[PDB]
């Protein structure tokens, strides 16, 4: 598996996770690849952010899927 | 303490009087403040210092 994770600035990440596996698995893949904290990460596919509670068993990912990774930002 | 007074009031009157002028006679100031010329000169010297 060579699922691509792309940041908006141009960084590339390659991870290996089976589709039946939980989104927490993707989370900890990017954890052990980069180290961005779990609570400061957002992932987007097909223009819609996925929820943590949806297992990717019935999901429109059949290979070649690119995941847009962003970091939560706040201001004052 | 009456000596400290009768001097602060005179100083305030002098400051409020010489405000709009640029070259003012000293006898005019003495007439306005009702004191002799020597006292006016001493007060002006003390104020400038």
């Amino acid at each position: 598996m060579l699922i691509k994770v792309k940041t908006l600035t141009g960084k590339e990440i390659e991870i290996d996770i089976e589709p039946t596996d939980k989104v927490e698995r993707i989370k900890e893949r990017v954890e052990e690849k980069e180290g961005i904290p779990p609570q400061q990460q957002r992932l987007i596919y097909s223009g819609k952010q996925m929820n943590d509670e949806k297992t990717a068993a019935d999901y429109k990912i059949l290979g070649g899927s690119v995941l847009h990774l962003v970091l939560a930002l706040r201001g004052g | 303490h009456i000596e400290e007074l009768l001097r602060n009031i005179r100083t305030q009157v002098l400051i409020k009087l010489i405000k709009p002028y640029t070259r003012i006679h000293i006898p005019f100031i003495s007439k306005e403040l009702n004191i002799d010329v020597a006292d006016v000169e001493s007060l002006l010297v003390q104020c400038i210092l």
């Binding site: - | 709009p20 002028y21 640029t22 070259r23 003012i24 006679h25 005019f28």
Partner: protein, 57 residues
């Protein structure tokens, strides 16, 4: 506003600073030119239109 020179007995109210007056007069000249041009355009629109068309080319 102003000061008093007692020996000369002269009250100075205000005085200009030359160069700011120069800028103000230049602005007034430009405003007069603009107003005259506007009046010229208003009184004879066709003549001023023809004149501007000739001057542009």
């Amino acid at each position: 506003n102003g000061f008093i020179d007692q020996i000369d007995g002269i009250v100075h109210f205000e005085t200009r600073e030359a160069l700011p007056t120069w800028d103000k007069q230049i602005q007034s000249l430009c405003f007069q030119v603009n107003n005259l041009l506007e009046k010229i355009s208003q009184t004879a629109p066709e003549w001023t239109a023809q004149a501007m068309e000739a001057q542009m080319a």
